[PDB]
Design a protein around this ligand. Structure first.
Ligand SMILES: [Cl-]
Ligand SMILES: [Cl-]
Ligand SMILES: [Cl-]
Ligand SMILES: [Cl-]
Ligand SMILES: [Cl-]
Ligand SMILES: [Cl-]
Ligand SMILES: [Cl-]
Ligand SMILES: [Cl-]
Ligand SMILES: [Cl-]
Ligand SMILES: [Cl-]
Ligand SMILES: [Cl-]
Ligand SMILES: [Cl-]
Lengths: 227, 226, 225, 225, 225, 226
């Protein structure tokens, strides 16, 4: 029998992901990272049911004022979703309508018998689950993100959401009330850094790496469940 | 009972009741967020943190590196969920005792299992997952902004993202100088009700007024495992 | 049973897990980071606030050109500090001289959920019936530093209940390797209130060293028995 | 002699240059833009506040990959408005229906520099000795809209002295082509003060339609003769 | 001829207009305001930086419901200060007790444009060929206070050249009527550089009371002769 | 001359020439804006303030209420107009002296009358008004953002809003730690070229790449009164 501890897994592809062994699916949906309303970012924990919306839309929210008037998609607000590996058109222009379907990551909301946590190494090595815990999946340490106006937020390192299984320099898409989505130059992803186990307490060594050797410098992580 | 604490908010002057199967720990006033040095920080409305037993327009102070602290001695803010009580004709701020009819009430409860929230994104109430029990039905409350457009939101997994009465203006702005008021830039953000067939379609801009607002709001339930 | 929380020493000493709980690992007290001038914090009552490796730059960023940078711009990190004071030149510190300054933490596992309770008065609040006291502390709500960026703690969380009150509970650290206290470094605490005066206009108060804990709300971290 | 300034009608009528000055051109009243959520304004008393062609998106941005985007993200523009009121439905407007809403301006050239003088009282301030009055108005100091971004006018500039007081002197316009008034659109004005009451605590005051101009500071725009 | 500028005493004394210029009025040194958490400043070398009447709340705001509020929310105003020290209790001040802390200013009229010149060294820069010196000072570039909001001065403007260097050149004032210095109140100045190696890594430097002026860039305000 | 000072920017390592009729006062390096304590403050590119004689990555310092000043001892920024010099393939920041080939140069000039800017909002060059003389042609440069998306802009009335050489990346980000680089979030804002035949209709979204950029940029002239 289950116990009431709900968490989420994200495919980061168009494929609906599988719940790890021992856990049961509740429902599936699309990977919902954060919104920007009136230029204020608010995010969802990627390891909770909040990060998995049944319905996709570029505008999942509305706002209301003190005159008792509400507006939906009637101003310049934002929403952000985890993306697939799918490429953007050569023209570099935004996309609208059903052409977005290949771009949005999918998620499964799962229920387990115990709490699921995440563990981080800060090194290239996979961290071990604590004693008495079971491994659910391997991943990379995903800490925070900024996009337009450099607004954004992050994930709790204790949460399964801080451990993405596919590393991507661009893990998310910027979407608008007017119906468009795109990657933009100021879209940033922040990750915990892989560090030298010998070099503690010294000036960090500035480092700039390019495609092909990026995972070389990313902290690793595991999501674990109590037995 | 097993240690899973959550909160219910009346959104009226009435102290709310804990749902069947849960036990009250204490009661207090509905505490949404603060603004210190122009930085918003909020509390999860489904956790004990959103229920303070002692109301005040200034529940906090700040301290510097010269070991000097100040209470209510600068322009900082606090925010509380409000009642349906309307504001005086003059549109001026209120101070002192006259605030009592405006502050929402809360009860901190204890249950045998975790309480989560489920959202539909449609006008229909979502079902609790298999093996879960309904605690209350409500509306999907996601974020909020006020002065300097600062603010934060609720976790959609949390009971706090599911308010039982919908209000265009669910909160009051309060100041260290002792005053509170609704302001033009006070905004509430809610998950939108969507048409089931039109997924991956350009959203249709919509502007609705009093009397037909609840109509475009996403619905939710708070559920506890059995 | 699976309920993980963290304790913070606020000294160079590695803290002890409370009665009935087992240590998972120890590390350094990690409060928050500032990337591209956006603050993001960790809950001080969860394993996230306790990193095994200390560094002034625990993170990196990557762009849409598939290029990543580590400590190659002006980003920040923040850690809870010890009572160690700063060199009188008032200049920043680098390298291994930082060790006496960084607070320490132990990640613990318990049989049940640990919550925090707050009084809003100088009196210690009682644990709800059926709950056990883990430690008593002060109500820590939020914090700002550079650009007045920052975040806070959940009052429900063990993290909102620091055992040692300090006007300056954290250090500002930089990618270039330096750390220091700065004038705009602020700590926010729940205020101690007079019980017989609710719904009355707050009385502005300014207190100095020796007098500070007099106006701080008190708290307890409790676990279900 | 080369001293250029601007006058704003705040109506659909193209304004007249004051006596002794010559028109250079006319256009639409351009207040400020918001790109990537950063406000930048134009001085309302300089030719920059008068754009020949109106559009809801007068600008574009370019990145380091040598790619530029026009009206392809969520950016803003702001224009001084007319007294024309908005539709029943409270929805935004697009297209040609915007005409009746955008204020007109004329760029003028004078023989001397034009300045503004402010009273901080209900009384019109006198031009300094040897200066000539160009127009009367109200002391307009700053403004905020979405994200509470915005900027203001220099009080030394003609731009800080609007001839027609309006609670809502400007319209918020978008790259998607729409414009509207919004609840968080604010206008800031220098306040009319009691002459006896200096270094006294300010008296909080809230006024409604019909009594608003009682509390606004007055101003004159003057040119050297 | 119509070229208006301002001089600031930075004391309780009403300053004198420089040789060849005429006083038009005097007042109090007005730096910037914060409405709805947005800073907007005045150029310290223009008449806007010199307000006839002092108050902690020189402005009001109005919404789209045609409702205006004066001193009825948490807004700010900022003024240049005197060398007057603050009471030992470190608490804010209200009322007429503020009189000894607000700097004074004189608005002057000259025959030609007044500009500022900066050295980036400890040496006083020379006026360009055909220009006359009005005063000597220090290079004042920007400032931040609450929420780290603020703005600065144009280096071309007389306002970027303060005659008296002060680590704390301004006071923070509130709608509720109080003013004080705060820990996060910051002044930014152009730095004095040693002429030999340009394009070389800046040397981090931290100095305290008694030598501060050794590292500040110098400036002169000049008028065309 | 009569006392009207303005600046010209080469946008190259070459010290620019004052336009005919004007006299040089001095020269220096093209200084755009700074970021202290995460607040941007800029200089007008058409005034002497945009031209500093001594380049440095940290032209400023800050002081607190304890009478303590710090120079280059925190994370602050400075921004300068750049040259067409490209960056090393490693994409890493530069320090010290590999820096000179990157900083734009400027000349501060004195004229007999006021120098203004005129903008077309079309691909055509705008004519100087009646009785005014052309100093140079250029492109309409309105604002800029970089780190934290902080930034400011130029006055369209000012010579500074009219850059002679269009660049997607007109400026470099420099730091107190001594480094400089282009970054992804470095943005330049320009007035757009518009279809004359349309006014008051939807803007047509447009995305344009290298080779076709100046096609959509508004044009400008800097003029002086005769
Ligand atoms: Cl929208
Ligand atoms: Cl882009
Ligand atoms: Cl306060
Ligand atoms: Cl209001
Ligand atoms: Cl960094
Ligand atoms: Cl400092
Ligand atoms: Cl746009
Ligand atoms: Cl609205
Ligand atoms: Cl106020
Ligand atoms: Cl302070
Ligand atoms: Cl620095
Ligand atoms: Cl970058």
């Amino acid at each position: 029998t289950t116990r009431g501890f709900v968490f989420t897994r994200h495919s980061q592809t168009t494929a609906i992901p599988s719940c790890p062994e021992g856990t049961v699916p509740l429902y599936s949906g699309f990977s919902f990272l954060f919104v920007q309303g009136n230029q204020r970012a608010h995010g969802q924990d990627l390891g909770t049911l909040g990060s998995c919306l049944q319905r996709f839309t570029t505008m999942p929210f509305l706002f209301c004022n003190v005159n008792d008037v509400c507006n939906f998609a009637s101003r310049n607000d934002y929403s952000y979703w985890l993306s697939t590996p799918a490429l953007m058109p050569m023209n570099m222009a935004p996309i609208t309508g059903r052409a977005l379907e290949p771009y949005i990551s999918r998620c499964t909301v799962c229920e387990g018998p115990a709490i699921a946590i995440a563990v981080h190494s800060q090194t290239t090595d996979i961290p071990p689950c604590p004693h008495g815990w079971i491994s659910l999946w391997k991943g990379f340490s995903f800490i925070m993100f900024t996009s337009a106006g450099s607004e954004g937020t992050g994930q709790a390192l204790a949460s399964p959401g801080s451990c993405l299984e596919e590393f991507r320099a661009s893990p998310f898409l910027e979407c608008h009330g007017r119906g468009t989505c795109n990657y933009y130059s100021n879209s940033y992803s922040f990750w915990l850094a892989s560090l030298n186990p010998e070099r503690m307490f010294r000036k960090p060594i500035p480092s700039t790496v390019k495609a092909g050797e990026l995972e070389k410098i990313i902290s690793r992580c595991q999501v674990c469940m109590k037995k």
